[PDB]
Amino acid sequence: GEEELAEKAEFARELANY
C-alpha cells in the first residue's frame, strides 16, 4: 500500500542522512 512505501520513503530520508 502507499503508506507502506511512504513510511519506507520517509524513513529512507530521515535515516539516510545518518
| Helix runs in 1-18, H state only | 2-14
First to last CA, the chain: 26
**Grid coordinates of 8:** 519506507
**Grid coordinates of 10:** 520517509
**Grid coordinates of 3:** 503508506
Name the method of structure determination: NMR
Q: Which 3 state secondary structure label does DSSP give 11?
A: helix
